[PDB]
Amino acid sequence: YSFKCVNSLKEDHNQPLFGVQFNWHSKEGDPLVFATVGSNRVTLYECHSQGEIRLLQSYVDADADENFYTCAWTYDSNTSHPLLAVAGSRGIIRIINPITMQCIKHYVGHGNAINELKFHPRDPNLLLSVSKDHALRLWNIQTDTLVAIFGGVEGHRDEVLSADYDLLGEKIMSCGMDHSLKLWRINSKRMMNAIKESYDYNPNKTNRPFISQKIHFPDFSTRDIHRNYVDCVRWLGDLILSKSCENAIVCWKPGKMEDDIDKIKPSESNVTILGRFDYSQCDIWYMRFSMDFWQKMLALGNQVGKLYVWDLEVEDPHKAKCTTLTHHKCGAAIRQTSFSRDSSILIAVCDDASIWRWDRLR
Amino acid sequence: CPCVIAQNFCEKFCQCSSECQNRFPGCRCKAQCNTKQCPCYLAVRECDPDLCLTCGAADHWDSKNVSCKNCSIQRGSKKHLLLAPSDVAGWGIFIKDPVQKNEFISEYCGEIISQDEADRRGKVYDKYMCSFLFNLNNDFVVDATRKGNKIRFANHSVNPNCYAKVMMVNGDHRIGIFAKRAIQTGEELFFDYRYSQADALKYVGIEREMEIP
Amino acid sequence: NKRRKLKNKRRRSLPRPHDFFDAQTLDAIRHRAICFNLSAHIESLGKGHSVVF
Amino acid sequence: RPRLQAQRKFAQSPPPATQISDLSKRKPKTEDFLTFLCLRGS
Amino acid sequence: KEAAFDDAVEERVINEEYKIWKKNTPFLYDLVMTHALEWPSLTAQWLPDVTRPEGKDFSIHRLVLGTHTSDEQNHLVIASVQLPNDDAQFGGFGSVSGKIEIEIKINHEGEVNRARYMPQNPCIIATKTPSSDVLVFDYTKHPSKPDPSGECNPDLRLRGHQKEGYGLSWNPNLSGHLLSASDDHTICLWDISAVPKE
Amino acid sequence: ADHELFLQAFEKPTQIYRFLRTRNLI
Amino acid sequence: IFQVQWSPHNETILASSGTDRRLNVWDLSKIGEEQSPEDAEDGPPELLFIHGGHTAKISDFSWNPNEPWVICSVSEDNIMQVWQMAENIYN
Amino acid sequence: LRIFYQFLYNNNTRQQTEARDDLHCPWCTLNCRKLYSLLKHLKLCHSRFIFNYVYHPKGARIDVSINECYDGSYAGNPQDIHRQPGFAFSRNGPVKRTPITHILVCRPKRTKASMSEFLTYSSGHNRLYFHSDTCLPLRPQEMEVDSEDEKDPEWLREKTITQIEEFSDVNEGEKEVMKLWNLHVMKHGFIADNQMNHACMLFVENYGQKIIKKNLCRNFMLHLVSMHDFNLISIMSIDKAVTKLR
Amino acid sequence: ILNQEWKQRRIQPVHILTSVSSLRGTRECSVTSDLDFPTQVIPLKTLNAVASVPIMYSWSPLQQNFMVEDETVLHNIPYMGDEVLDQDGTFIEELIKNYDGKVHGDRECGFINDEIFVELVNALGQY
Ligand SMILES: Nc1ncnc2c1ncn2[C@@H]1O[C@H](CSCC[C@H](N)C(=O)O)[C@@H](O)[C@H]1O
Ligand SMILES: [Mg+2]
């Protein structure tokens, strides 16, 4: 439980970055690779020993002005090539193949900026895209068809911000500016019929446009947790985690401690809070936390450049942990944290187009 | 009589007597309850299918070929509409097939709210200087932000080819849009918004054409 | 009309028609032209219209 | 005041009118820009 | 590879060039008429007959077009055109509604590889097909509204070829005399000047 | 005034016609 | 080259179509006529005109009766064009 | 005559030059022999800019500026622009699209040269239409009679049932009935009172098996009572319903 | 379970940038090292283009009007481009007065699950 600054870098365009994503699809032993997106550029690096990090590749968009926002690593079932997709303010989604160093797929169906991208833990052709259009879409990146559109008569009213798959990949949570957090399901018969259909469609075959699925109702929701924005949520086994600009992270479960997660009636009107976590100076929004693939530690960026670290272990959240690893160079802000498949290294992005690196000493 | 003090007639659902003079007779017109003679047409309404047993309004509540050109909204036979990025600002509707002047096109549906309520959302709509608000009567305002149909995507002009008509149907106000001339395939649609000329130039100041003379 | 006025159409700000050419197809032209000239020297010798050997 | 402050995303916070050759000056601006005389038309 | 990149470039260039040629046309032609069909064609034949309605500024002509669709029902088509027949006239030049209109559709089995009208009878035309034979038709014997079923009266098809071809020529002086030429390395000649038992 | 703006802008249309020059010439 | 067609109404006028997305018009009278170096760099004399409409392989074309100087053209791009050249070129 | 140029940049700056070997195009080296023809060839061919004739005393001067709009965008099947890459510009198989027709050259003027002067309609669909609800392209075949609009929106049927279920002071033998009816009401849009007789007729004509399978006909009759009470049924049909029921 | 399924795969390694001769002239990027390391330099890579579409929002279709009860509390606060209201931060307060200062989440003063409320009500005897 000790990371040390073994390297720190800085870009040249000096425009703030947002994204950090190790490729968690490393065949055991392969080098550590990770990427980061900035104003209108992407960056490819590789972790080396002795705090060495090596520039690998970088692309850029010129034909317009955009501030890229998110990324996600996946692969191709067909030939196992690594796959990275990104999206920015323009609201378009691109798909790049580093093996050929080209973009092979682009998607345009939103109406505003995008805010996050994630994949189904099991299926690799299912991309979830969260936007400001109040609508959370979901694509089959392989047959080039939309599937669902969550939002409508009972959706979010203002600029959905963040979402998160359950650990197994059948349940989602969503959070946006309207203090509102709503539950969606995927396991429903209708849903999976739809998905299977999606995996089968030839445009040349029919004169019909594929028929998506519109969903106008959350499985459950409330706004009683915070009295401010909510901009990042994390499934916890069957528990919940969320942050606000109120300088505290909270864990809770819906209903009562006795209430199972999978028996919850849609008209449920109660929630159970368990504990709180604390920190200092997160007085702005759009700042995220991450966790190890082994769900044992917690990382979080900070406004003034600090850090705050806990353990996801039996440490009682009343007095679970407190670990602040700090350096004296930048205190502008830190947007996002990221671990490898193991807990070896931890990266974070400062607000000034500067990178950091922290090598763990257990 | 509340009907009376409302300067409004009696509808068959009123409790004004079965001969209460405050009631309304009903269309009698023969060719179509449509031109400048038919009384329903003057006191702008649609000849209800209980009364105009002459212009066919009653007939063919199932069949779809009638004579009363003043029954369409109830039957609701709009046209086939398309969508595309406009040539003025963002999106904008496009018609599909030719149409003769003074003809039905569609309704302008939406949510309904009290007057003052509409003055709150409008405060924000003004900020971005974009809105969907539309005033229905002295008391109610229709809102096409969260719900509606394609027509919400029509653009403003000053010499347009369509116009609105606050009508009165079955004791309920509505809104219809009708062509202002003949129109063939593919054109775009407009109609004056009837803004105050000051704000009209503030929010909607695009011309699409220069001074011909 | 059989005869109307000349071509006149303008307003405050019409939408921009989203030009076609991309940087990605642009730079290839530049590169090609450079090595071409350094094989040819026409802007220097052939005045853009005559080829040296 | 606390329930009245708007939330914030970010922190608190040529002389010689020479010739057409200016064209031939412009398109190559590296890697052996020929004619050696375009630099005057910088 | 390379050819892909190169072709993208070439496409963009061609687009530019067409833009220029369009901008430059007005000083170049005495007429510009462009029209887009849903499916392309492979044939071209002007019907030798013309009608010119009075009180107007335009003639009327009929054109013989084929069809090679992707997969769906094939058709033989002949449509209408309103050429300006005037020197002082110029919505655009005449009426406002339309200057071109389809008038003749006939179901067709396979694409059209060739089509020419008979010089002696314009109501007689020939047809080369993806098959190894020839088809003849007389439009006056079929409605413009096409058979929604599909294939219909071949109207005395022919025989004598084994692969498809493209050659087609009636004899101008002699009726019925018509030549053919196909991948068979052969020239086949029918004489339909008199075939009572079709 | 980063004159590269004036440069970069008028840079673009040039090479196009330049290529086009040769092309049309042949 | 895939098509050649003489001109009705004109004894010395012919037409050449092919795949180059172009269309030519020749002249049998101007065979080897001394032309200015700029006329020559324009092209040889006997070549009369070149059509510049289509943007694909020109599938087919045709003269017509009933009209002196017009030809329709069909490409592989669902495109049908009809034109009449300017008059000044001849005479 | 010495010829000069001037390169405007929205007046924030500029640059000026002079034409060498003038009357030959500074780009395509086209030999124009007149200021007239040269001005023409320039304002037409090299169109991506704009020009102006200044007539400096030395013989000619042209202050150039960039075009502002220059609507240059792809002119083909307007759909290809959005084909997922690798398929766009396939150019290897016939494709169907909507018909259009333009006219550009109808009757020329054929005027004469005038240096003082120096200082097209549509028919058919000419754009890319989109789906009303997903903002996706619209194939030329999908734009057929399919009109993606009718009286019954799914989300509405759901919402009304749910709202009904909020009510506490009701028996299931009533809620089920109200829903089973209101939905069929929506399904056809009944307005005229002369329809209500046929209405209840068709209602059981559809929901016969169900109410039987629901064993709920007795509350159906209570509803018939209520409706006659509201002066829309005659007694001459109330029974007639229970008759047709079995 | 997940680690298991992950253990059934095989995935390529990436190769670092290798500039192609197709662009002898381009731009490049470099990253300074804040620590004792040199700086690497690599030519940028250009992406193809895609076309965008105008803005739009969420909305559900309809064919007849719809009643809506009134709204008394704000329940949410908008967000401009954070530079506009940097000059007109009062508009917020104006709106606040319009709704007479009432937004959901405000005046929360903690939380209540109505069970402790019932307990206090039974406990808060008349004193
Ligand atoms: N002609 C015009 N000029 C300027 N603004 C216009 C306009 N037509 C519509 N608008 C804007 O659009 C709003 C009406 S809602 C229609 C929006 C538009 N049709 C679209 O592309 O989505 C108005 O509030 C106004 O702000
Ligand atoms: Mg493409």
DSSP conformation class of H173: H
- Which tokens go with H235? 């007694």
* CB-side neighbour CA atoms (13 Å) of H78: 16
Name the burial class of residue C21, with classes exposed (0-12), middle (13-18) and buried (19+) by CB atoms within 10 angstroms of its CB. middle
Which of A18, A54, A11, A5 lies closest to A329, judged by CA? A5
Q: How far is C51 from chain I (nearest CA, A)?
A: 23
Which of E107, E92, E100, E16 lies closest to G80, judged by CA? E100
- Quote the CA–CA distance of C37 and C43 in Å, as a whole number: 7
- Quote the CA–CA distance of H88 and D1 in Å, as a whole number: 57
Check CB contact under 8 Å for I96 and D4: yes
Which of B88, B78, B71 lies closest to B189, judged by CA? B88
Ligand having the closest approach to the CA of E12: 2
End-to-end CA distance of chain A: 5
- Quote the CA–CA distance of H140 and A86 in Å, as a whole number: 31
Q: What type of residue sits at position C13?
A: S
Which of A94, G34, G40, E40 lies closest to H99, judged by CA? E40
CB within 8 Å of A9: residues ≥ 6 apart: A53, A354, A355, A357, I31, I32, I33, I34
Ligand having the closest approach to the CA of E8: 2
G33 to A59, C14, E179, G50: CA distances (angstroms): 58, 52, 40, 18
Ligand having the closest approach to the CA of A104: 2
- Quote the CA–CA distance of I68 and B41 in Å, as a whole number: 31
- Which tokens go with A315? 């440490």
CB within 8 Å of A239: residues ≥ 6 apart: A251, A252, A253, A274
Check CB contact under 8 Å for E12 and C29: no
> With the C-alpha atoms ordered A104, A110, A116, A122, is the resulting torsion angle positive or negative?
negative
Provide the β-strand partners of residue A107.
A93
- Which tokens go with B82? 């398309």
- Which tokens go with B113? 């709210």
Determine which residue's CA is closest to atom 9 belonging to ligand 1: B155
Left, alpha or beta for A69 (phi > 0: left; psi -120 to 50: alpha)? alpha
- Number of F:H CB contacts under 8 A? 27
- Quote the CA–CA distance of A108 and H81 in Å, as a whole number: 12
Report DSSP letters for chain B, one per residue. Answer: -HHHHTT----TTS-S-TT-TTS------SS-TTSSS-HHHHTT----TTT-TTTTSSTTSSSS--S-TT-HHHH-----EEEEE-SSSSEEEEE-S-B-SS-EEEE---EEEEHHHHHHHHHHHHHHT----EE-SSSEEEE-SSEE-GGGGPBP-SS-SEEEEEEEETTEEEEEEEESS-B-TT-B-B------HHHHHHH----SS----
Name chain H contacts of G76, Cβ cutoff 8 Å.
94
Check CB contact under 8 Å for G77 and H76: yes
A62 touches chain C (CB under 8 A): yes
CB within 8 Å of C43: residues ≥ 6 apart: C37, D24, D34, D35
D27 touches chain F (CB under 8 A): yes
- 3 state DSSP class of I65: coil
Yes or no: say if H135 and E77 are a contact pair by the CB < 8 Å rule. no
- Quote the CA–CA distance of G74 and E36 in Å, as a whole number: 10
Testing ligand 1's pocket by substitution, the residue of B128, B156, B157 carrying the most ligand atoms inside 8 A of its CB is B156
User: For residue H88, how far is its CA from the centre of ligand 2 (angstroms)?
Assistant: 5
- Which tokens go with A282? 């997160």
Q: What is the 3-state secondary structure (H, E, C) of B42-101?
A: HCCCCCCCCCCCCCCCCCCCCCCCCCCCCCHHHHCCCCCEEEEECCCCCEEEEECCCECC
Check CB contact under 8 Å for D10 and I93: no
- Quote the CA–CA distance of B17 and B11 in Å, as a whole number: 11
- DSSP H/E element including E32: strand E29-36
Testing ligand 1's pocket by substitution, the residue of B82, B83, B86, B88 carrying the most ligand atoms inside 8 A of its CB is B88
E46 to G3, G85, G89: CA distances (angstroms): 16, 18, 25
- Quote the CA–CA distance of H117 and H101 in Å, as a whole number: 32
Q: How far is A198 from chain I (nearest CA, A)?
A: 23
Which of A323, A362, A361, A330 lies closest to A348, judged by CA? A330
- 3 state DSSP class of I8: coil
Asked whether B108 lines ligand 1 (CB < 6 A), one says no
Check CB contact under 8 Å for C28 and E9: yes
Pairing between β-strand B91-95 and β-strand H14-19 as defined by DSSP bridges: unpaired
Yes or no: say if A193 and A162 are a contact pair by the CB < 8 Å rule. no
Yes or no: say if I55 and A158 are a contact pair by the CB < 8 Å rule. no
CB within 8 Å of I102: residues ≥ 6 apart: I72, I73, I74
Angle at CA H168, nearest 5°, toward H165 and H169?
120
User: For residue G51, how far is its CA from the centre of ligand 2 (angstroms)?
Assistant: 30
- Which tokens go with H46? 């090299």
DSSP conformation class of D2: G
Count of positions (residues) in chain E: 198
Q: What are phi and psi of E20, to 5 degrees?
A: -65, -50
Yes or no: say if A96 and A103 are a contact pair by the CB < 8 Å rule. yes
Determine which residue's CA is closest to atom 13 belonging to ligand 1: B130
Which residue is closest to I44 within chain C, CA to CA? C24
CB within 8 Å of E113: residues ≥ 6 apart: E42, E66, E127, E128, E129, E130, E164, E165, E166
Q: How far is C28 from chain I (nearest CA, A)?
A: 6
H26 touches chain D (CB under 8 A): yes
Pairing between β-strand A354-360 and β-strand A345-350 as defined by DSSP bridges: antiparallel
For testing contact with chain F, the best of D20, D21, D22, D23 (most F CBs within 10 A): D23
- Quote the CA–CA distance of H236 and H224 in Å, as a whole number: 12
A104 touches chain H (CB under 8 A): yes
- Number of E:F CB contacts under 8 A? 6
CB within 8 Å of B21: residues ≥ 6 apart: none
Angle at CA I71, nearest 5°, toward B107 and A252?
115
Which of A272, A281, A288, A274 lies closest to A317, judged by CA? A274
H185 to A36, A220, B206, H178, H182: CA distances (angstroms): 57, 30, 45, 10, 5
- Which tokens go with A220? 């459950």
Q: What type of residue sits at position B28?
A: R
Give the strand order in the sheet containing H14-19: H14-19, H2-8, H59-66, H49-50
Exposure string for H213-246, b = 16+ CB within 10 A, e = fewer: ebebbebbeeebeebeeeeebeeebbeebeeeee
Pairing between β-strand A102-107 and β-strand A114-119 as defined by DSSP bridges: unpaired
Yes or no: say if E75 and E108 are a contact pair by the CB < 8 Å rule. yes
Q: What are phi and psi of E142, to 5 degrees?
A: -140, 145
Yes or no: say if B118 and B141 are a contact pair by the CB < 8 Å rule. yes
- Quote the CA–CA distance of B176 and E5 in Å, as a whole number: 53
Asked whether B145 lines ligand 1 (CB < 6 A), one says no
Angle at CA A235, nearest 5°, toward A229 and A237?
150
Yes or no: say if A175 and A242 are a contact pair by the CB < 8 Å rule. yes
End-to-end CA distance of chain G: 29
**Touch between chain F and chain C (3+ CB pairs, < 8 Å)?**
yes
Testing ligand 1's pocket by substitution, the residue of B91, B202, B203, B209 carrying the most ligand atoms inside 8 A of its CB is B203
- Quote the CA–CA distance of H99 and G78 in Å, as a whole number: 9
* CB-side neighbour CA atoms (13 Å) of A239: 13
- Quote the CA–CA distance of H234 and F14 in Å, as a whole number: 86
Q: What is the 3-state secondary structure (H, E, C) of chain A?
A: CCEEEEEEEECCCCCCCCCCEECCCCCCCCCEEEEEECCCEEEEEEEECCCEEEEEECEECCCCCCCCCEEEEEECCCCCCEEEEEECCCCCEEEEECCCCEEEEEECCCCCCEEEEEECCCCCCEEEEEECCCCEEEEECCCCEEEEEECCCCCCCCCEEEEEECCCCCEEEEEECCCCEEEEECCCHHHHHHHHHHCCCCCCCCCCCCCCEEECCCCEEECCCCCCCEEEEEEECCEEEEEECCCEEEEEEECCCCCCCCCCCCCCCCEEEEEEEECCCCCCCCCCEEECCCCCEEEECCCCCCCCEEECCCCCCCCCCCECCCCCCCCCCEEEEEECCCCCEEEEEECCCEEEEEEECC
Method: cryo-EM
- DSSP H/E element including I21: none
CB within 8 Å of A100: residues ≥ 6 apart: none
DSSP conformation class of H183: H
Which residue is closest to B90 within chain I, CA to CA? I54
- Quote the CA–CA distance of B176 and B164 in Å, as a whole number: 6
Yes or no: say if A358 and A352 are a contact pair by the CB < 8 Å rule. no
Q: Which residue has the tokens 């200062």?
A: I101
- Quote the CA–CA distance of B62 and A141 in Å, as a whole number: 46
DSSP conformation class of G6: P
CB within 8 Å of E134: residues ≥ 6 apart: E126, E127, E128, E157, E158, E161, E180, E190
Which of H28, H94, H72 lies closest to E15, judged by CA? H72
CB within 8 Å of G2: residues ≥ 6 apart: G17, G18, G19
Provide the β-strand partners of residue A96.
A84, A103
Yes or no: say if H84 and A109 are a contact pair by the CB < 8 Å rule. no
- Quote the CA–CA distance of A113 and A93 in Å, as a whole number: 10
Provide the β-strand partners of residue I32.
A10
Determine which residue's CA is closest to atom 2 belonging to ligand 1: B204
Give the strand order in the sheet containing A220-222: A160-165, A171-176, A181-185, A220-222
- Quote the CA–CA distance of I10 and A29 in Å, as a whole number: 11
G83 touches chain H (CB under 8 A): yes
Angle at CA H122, nearest 5°, toward H120 and H128?
130
**Chains touching E by CB (3 or more pairs below 8 Å):** C, F, G, H
Which of H18, H75, I104 lies closest to A228, judged by CA? I104
- Quote the CA–CA distance of G46 and I94 in Å, as a whole number: 82
**Chains touching A by CB (3 or more pairs below 8 Å):** C, D, H, I
Ligand having the closest approach to the CA of I50: 2
- Quote the CA–CA distance of E33 and G58 in Å, as a whole number: 16
Q: How many C-beta atoms surround the C-beta of residue H166 within 10 A?
A: 8
H104 touches chain E (CB under 8 A): yes
Asked whether B213 lines ligand 1 (CB < 6 A), one says no
Q: What are phi and psi of E38, to 5 degrees?
A: -70, -50
Atom of ligand 1 nearest to the CA of B89: 21
Asked whether B158 lines ligand 1 (CB < 6 A), one says no
Which residue is closest to I19 within chain A, CA to CA? A57
User: For residue A94, how far is its CA from the centre of ligand 2 (angstroms)?
Assistant: 12
- Quote the CA–CA distance of H129 and B35 in Å, as a whole number: 36
- Quote the CA–CA distance of H29 and H26 in Å, as a whole number: 6
Which of B51, B11, B9, B10 lies closest to B33, judged by CA? B51
I89 touches chain D (CB under 8 A): yes
- Quote the CA–CA distance of G86 and E25 in Å, as a whole number: 10
- Quote the CA–CA distance of I106 and H237 in Å, as a whole number: 59
DSSP conformation class of I30: E
Name the burial class of residue A78, with classes exposed (0-12), middle (13-18) and buried (19+) by CB atoms within 10 angstroms of its CB. exposed
CB within 8 Å of A68: residues ≥ 6 apart: A18, A19, A37, A38, A39, A40, A41, A42, A86, A87, A88
- Quote the CA–CA distance of I94 and H102 in Å, as a whole number: 55
- Output helix, strand, coil percentages for chain G, rounded to the nearest 5: 5, 30, 65
Name chain B contacts of I66, Cβ cutoff 8 Å.
110-112, 147
Q: Which of B58, B94, B185 sits opposite H192 (nearest CB)?
A: B58
Atom of ligand 1 nearest to the CA of I56: 22
Asked whether B20 lines ligand 1 (CB < 6 A), one says no
Exposure string for D7-27, b = 16+ CB within 10 A, e = fewer: eeeeeeebeeebbbbbbbbbb
Q: How many C-beta atoms surround the C-beta of residue A211 within 10 A?
A: 11
Provide the β-strand partners of residue A9.
A355, I33
Yes or no: say if A253 and A240 are a contact pair by the CB < 8 Å rule. yes
Q: Where are the alpha helices (DSSP H) in E38-80?
A: none
- Quote the CA–CA distance of E47 and E52 in Å, as a whole number: 14
Check CB contact under 8 Å for H17 and D14: no
- Quote the CA–CA distance of I33 and A11 in Å, as a whole number: 9
Q: What type of residue sits at position H71?
A: D
E96 touches chain C (CB under 8 A): no
Report DSSP letters for C1-53, one per residue. Answer: --S--S-----S-PPP------HHHHHHHHHHHHHHHHHH-IIIIITTS----
Asked whether B130 lines ligand 1 (CB < 6 A), one says yes
Atom of ligand 1 nearest to the CA of B129: 26
Yes or no: say if I43 and I27 are a contact pair by the CB < 8 Å rule. yes
Q: How far is H94 from chain A (nearest CA, A)?
A: 13
Report DSSP letters for D8-31, one per residue. Answer: -SS-----S---TTHHHHHS--SS
H185, H186, H189, H194 alpha-carbon torsion, rounded to 10°: 10
